[PDB]
Design a protein around this ligand. Structure first.
Ligand SMILES: CCCN(CCC)C(=O)c1cc(C)cc(C(=O)N[C@@H](Cc2cc(F)cc(F)c2)[C@H](O)[C@H]2C[C@@H](Cc3ccccc3)CCN2)c1
Length: 390
């Protein structure tokens, strides 16, 4: 591991998001910031809010510059409105550099901030094409690269605990690593496999085959990427296109048929509980997603365990049972490889080479009988036809 200063710099959990500490302004104002590969705006609370115990105070920064422009960002979830400006930004446990970046000062929000998440802003790591108001508002990472010698690459190790973290525990626990400008080899086991970034807007990829316990879901591969497939640390669940979700759930139910679960469970709404330590991991199937490789006609697969797709939650009675929610949801906007999927892997966002790498995470949760995997190569034909065109 060659980036010790950035190892273990993340905190949080899949259900509330993973955040990194950052400073804004002069003198520096410390804020916790949501790491989001699914959007492209850097924004921070800048006014009192019931869920914020701190916020960006522009009048206290000598380096604050007002852009005299409003900004509106609607996510799938919530939304916020703010005021554009620029200021000096640093990452304490990151590259030892300070850059001038665009910052949206959040003045109004709805269903955006999360009670108890301990974060006060968001770091959109995707491309300018999806930045608001438009692509002229340079994303933070683009600024970082243009202004310094930091390599145009970052990598994420999101670490799920495999069990519930109470409010005090989640504040003291290491939630992962964001390596800015490199790849730290102590964060994964095995080899890194790369899939092409199809287009530079979201981190878009192409899925070419899906298996549930080795059984081919057998859908036209174009269905898996309808209307796109993205890697998104800012969304908890693995979200699948309506038709794919319906097929996947039918197959996961069939594989786990020795136990009957209520419809509310499969809807990702209600928790299921087992007596302490008795969770029947073995009755649930592994899920394999095959991704386009960098070599013509070649693919590789990433395999996740139910320890990734079943999300640990505290029992509504705080008892001693081990409880979970089904972390796979239907989508109307394409496949979203969310945080619960990223928890099984070390993910390399290699912007410079327009590719995303996957390797088994040194912190993925598993059991003595099964482990997550990244395996290849597989001969796969016509993978370009798996991509959706509007
Ligand atoms: C329930 C609260 C959020 N949450 C738990 C904690 C992560 C989720 O699992 C979740 C669920 C759904 C259905 C959507 C999003 C969602 O919209 N996430 C976005 C980031 C986010 C995190 C939060 F923490 C609260 C929020 F407002 C928002 C992400 O950028 C998402 C936005 C999408 C819409 C978009 C497109 C282009 C540009 C901007 C936004 C595109 C895919 N990425 C997030």
């Amino acid at each position: 591991g060659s980036f010790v200063e950035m190892v273990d710099n993340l905190r949080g959990k899949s259900g509330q998001g993973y955040y990194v500490e950052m400073t804004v302004g002069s003198p520096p104002q410390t804020l916790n910031i949501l790491v989001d590969t699914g959007s492209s705006n850097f924004a921070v609370g800048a006014a009192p809010h019931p869920f914020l115990h701190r916020y960006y105070q522009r009048q206290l920064s000598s380096t604050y510059r007002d852009l005299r422009k409003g900004v509106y960002v609607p996510y799938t979830q919530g939304k916020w409105e703010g005021e554009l400006g620029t200021d000096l930004v640093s990452i304490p446990h990151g590259p030892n550099v300070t850059v001038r970046a665009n910052i949206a000062a959040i003045t109004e929000s709805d269903k955006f901030f999360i009670n108890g998440s301990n974060w006060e802003g968001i770091l959109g790591l995707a491309y300018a094409e999806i930045a608001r108001p438009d692509d002229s508002l340079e994303p933070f990472f683009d600024s970082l690269v243009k202004q310094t010698h930091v390599p145009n690459l970052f990598s994420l190790q999101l670490c799920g605990a495999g069990f519930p973290l109470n409010q005090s525990e989640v504040l003291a626990s290491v939630g992962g690593s964001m390596i800015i400008g490199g790849i730290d080899h102590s964060l994964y086991t095995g080899s890194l496999w790369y899939t092409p970034i199809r287009r530079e807007w979201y981190y878009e990829v192409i899925i070419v085959r899906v298996e549930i316990n080795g059984q081919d879901l057998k859908m036209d591969c174009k269905e898996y990427n309808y209307d796109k497939s993205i890697v998104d640390s800012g969304t908890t669940n693995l979200r699948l296109p309506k038709k794919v979700f319906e097929a996947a759930v039918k197959s996961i139910k069939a594989a786990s048929s020795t136990e009957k679960f209520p419809d509310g469970f499969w809807l990702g709404e209600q928790l299921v509980c087992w007596q302490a330590g008795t969770t029947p991991w073995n009755i649930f199937p592994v899920i394999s997603l095959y991704l386009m490789g960098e070599v013509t006609n070649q693919s590789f697969r990433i395999t996740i365990l139910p320890q990734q797709y079943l999300r640990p939650v505290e029992d509504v009675a705080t008892s001693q049972d081990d409880c979970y929610k089904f972390a796979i949801s239907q989508s109307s906007t394409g496949t979203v490889m969310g945080a619960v999927i990223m928890e099984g892997f070390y993910v390399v966002f290699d912007r410079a080479r327009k590719r995303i790498g996957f390797a088994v995470s040194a912190c993925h949760v598993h059991d003595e009988f099964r482990t997550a995997a990244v395996e290849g190569p597989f001969v796969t034909l016509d993978m370009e036809d798996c991509g959706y065109n509007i």
